[PDB]
């Protein structure tokens, strides 16, 4: 039995083709092809339903201490209403999940993590809360019930602007604020996304979720976008998909996510998994996540990657055709000496080797709104 | 990595033999044999750590409507601070989990459900919360972070009475109240248990959990008890163990839990699976959960139950030696014609047919405290 978000009937009413995703029923696409939906997102904007993601709040005076004991980012340095992408890492340096953490001006941390890792992540945070409370510290956690919508694309901001009093130009990439959206009070708008385009994510009380979705969709610039387009868009943007490109068996260094380590904590070697991660940062690491491009048929997950001498050196973790570049793009792991952009490699596609080239990611330049 | 309750160290210092249980680290027993611990519980009182159980609060003016859309009991009829055992059912009439729900004098329902089904149960309630909010109703859900202790036995009330101002003789079976216990304020004490004896359950803030357990244990009447004893006690008491005696393929009627079906609920047919369940109340049921007793080798779960001619008619769901009766006890399903107490049957024990007798449950008379 698949779980349903507050927009379930909304999706079906608009031609959504529902499929199973992390135990939820979500549209893989609607009436337009996922390829056209993908292109529409980069020229205008698309609305995605991400209400299945886990939304939590960390309360208490020791909220930052709790969070930093679990993630690799510089959380203390976050200014009010400023957030950062980060990772949950275990003592061995493996990635438990990727997330976004925001320091709200309400005195709490607002966290959003993967739908497919909600049981694991919630238990992890609960365990830490329990640990700290037993030590007499002040901390707590709340699971939010709000729906979550993502409006992404070059015209996403202007579409939302018609529904908010706040001048969105004051909401730079990775900052957020609580505002009334299209009549719905208590929404949190964050300048973020999973597409590489400018965009916002809206945490909206369920009672007003459908109203908000409809209000946004009424704008000619907007079209709904499903799972397929969401995947091709994030891949072109060089963004990881937990469970595919990174997992508990990959550290932030192997995953080419060294940038997620907080500036202060990286230099101090003070973060979860540092004993394994630091030596890798210095160079002692066996593999690296790289981007790959090729012609012909698309490279797919689990496909072997070989050098020109017939030796298997790695595996593709994600891959699909790129509508924006009209080439096939993919992510995979290869030894460091084969990770330089421009390197030619062989990838098994449909039981036959195809010539591919290592490419620097993102494949499609991002268009974030920064000051 | 096993999750730890706040009493992790407490258990280790008291001789607790830790084992994995639903992803948590809990003592299967301590220094005393589980059979002696069992006998101790029915003569004095034992302390059990059940902090791994899911504790949730349902908020809002429509909290009762929400819970009733998920359970089979008459929740509205519960007096302030009165609770009842109930069941989450699916549209097929099967049971998703058993639970205890209390209608607190505050503005919320206090729910306690199985650790082994927390992911399932939490998702069920959270999704229903969102569905009702979408419909314009007022409801919410909070996951409590408190520990949970159960003090069970004929001298349990006497022991706890030394740590509370409230007159426990005025706290009847299945009623509860917020109290300061042994110096720890904000605890919720409920007159309930999983042993058949008189007893209480104490929801206590993590910060004061160890203090409370330590204080309770100072009284010589008390001895810690683990999982093995917990299981033999509940079985003798005729109490179900979700996943064993009842599951998604057993209705409340087949599971001999017709009493959990609310009078009003039966007439309204407004609970999941009512179309299937209610009709069975007439007698249209193919099987029924019963208690079994025998000598020699213990009856074990999954063992076939046969009539005296040797024809298979059912299956054992739970079984273990009974310290209180000095015989073997078990639960299982058989057609209604063989459910009358005293019925002679055969059970495949250690690959051999062994004679058993259907026994009325509870096997051991309960000692619940009622006015």
UniProtKB/Swiss-Prot annotation, chains A, B:
Keywords: Aminotransferase, Disease variant, Mitochondrion, Transferase, Transit peptide. Its EC number is 2.1.2.10. GO terms for molecular function: aminomethyltransferase activity; transaminase activity. Gene3D superfamilies: Aminomethyltransferase beta-barrel domains, Aminomethyltransferase fragment, Probable tRNA modification gtpase trme, domain 1. GO terms for biological process: glycine catabolic process; glycine decarboxylation via glycine cleavage system. Substrate binds at residues 201, 230, 368. It catalyses: N(6)-[(R)-S(8)-aminomethyldihydrolipoyl]-L-lysyl-[protein] + (6S)-5,6,7,8-tetrahydrofolate = N(6)-[(R)-dihydrolipoyl]-L-lysyl-[protein] + (6R)-5,10-methylene-5,6,7,8-tetrahydrofolate + NH4(+). Disulfide bonds: none annotated. Changing residue 289 to H: In GCE2; loss of aminomethyltransferase activity. It holds the Pfam family GCV_T_C. It is linked to Glycine encephalopathy 2: A form of glycine encephalopathy, a metabolic disorder characterized by a high concentration of glycine in the body fluids. Affected individuals typically have severe neurological symptoms, including seizure, lethargy, and muscular hypotonia soon after birth. Most of them die within the neonatal period. Atypical cases have later disease onset and less severely affected psychomotor development. The glycine cleavage system is composed of four proteins: P, T, L and H. Belongs to the GcvT family. NCBIfam families: gcvT (TIGR00528), PRK00389.1 (NF001567). The glycine cleavage system catalyzes the degradation of glycine. This is Aminomethyltransferase, mitochondrial. It comes from Homo sapiens (Human).
